């Protein structure tokens, strides 16, 4: 669905441009070094998380939603991704959701941004 004008992820308000920039960064990922970068990586639907996606069919990926983006990190040049993510359709780039680890029901998992 359309990239929203803003989102509130556990108290961090991001703009449409922050969200777009995150997806752009994810789509621009290529091979480097000796292993995959941690992000983007696949997102899976977990019933307990109560997350609704607004793109259609997957596959889906997650990428960090950060200020001053896009996020980038690699082996030996680690930068924290923080708790917030964009979910997008892995192949098309379509926006699916913004999610966050902040306030989630597990420490590894997600809840929908508000
Ligand atoms: N605030 C946070 N920052 C970094 N990783 C987090 C995180 N909260 C949960 N994680 C999870 O901890 C592991 C190490 O980063 C990953 O599985 C990651 O899930 P994620 O990649 O889906 O965000
Ligand atoms: Ca659509
Ligand atoms: Ca704007
Ligand atoms: Ca890469
Ligand atoms: Ca769901």
* Ligand-binding site membership of 67 (annotated): no
Complete domains list, the chain, with CATH: 1-114 (3.10.450.30)
DSSP secondary structure, 9-65, as one string: ETTEEEEHHHHHHHHHHHHT----TTS--S-SEEE---GGG----SS-S--EEEEE-
Show Cβ contacts of residue 67 under 8 Å, excluding neighbours closer than 6 positions: 12, 14, 18
Resolution in angstroms, to 1 decimal, for this deposition?
Answer: 1.0
Q: How many residues does the chain have?
A: 114
Question: For residue 18, how far is its CA from the centre of ligand 2 (angstroms)?
Answer: 20
Method: X-ray
* Ligand-binding site membership of 70 (annotated): no
Determine the Cα–Cα distance for residues 42 and 1; give it in Å rounded to an integer.
19
8 A C-beta contact, residue 103 and residue 95: no
């Amino acid at each position: 669905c359309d990239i929203p004008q803003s989102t509130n992820c556990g108290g961090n308000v991001y703009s449409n441009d922050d969200i777009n920039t995150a997806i752009q960064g994810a789509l621009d990922d290529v091979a480097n070094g000796d292993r995959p970068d941690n992000y983007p990586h696949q997102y899976y639907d977990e019933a307990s998380e109560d997350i609704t996606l607004c793109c259609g069919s997957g596959p889906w990926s997650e990428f960090p939603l950060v200020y001053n983006g896009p996020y980038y990190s690699s082996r030996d040049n680690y930068v924290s991704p923080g708790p917030d993510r964009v979910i997008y359709q892995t192949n098309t780039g379509e926006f699916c959701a913004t999610v966050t680890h902040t306030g989630a029901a597990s420490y590894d998992g997600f809840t929908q941004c508000s």
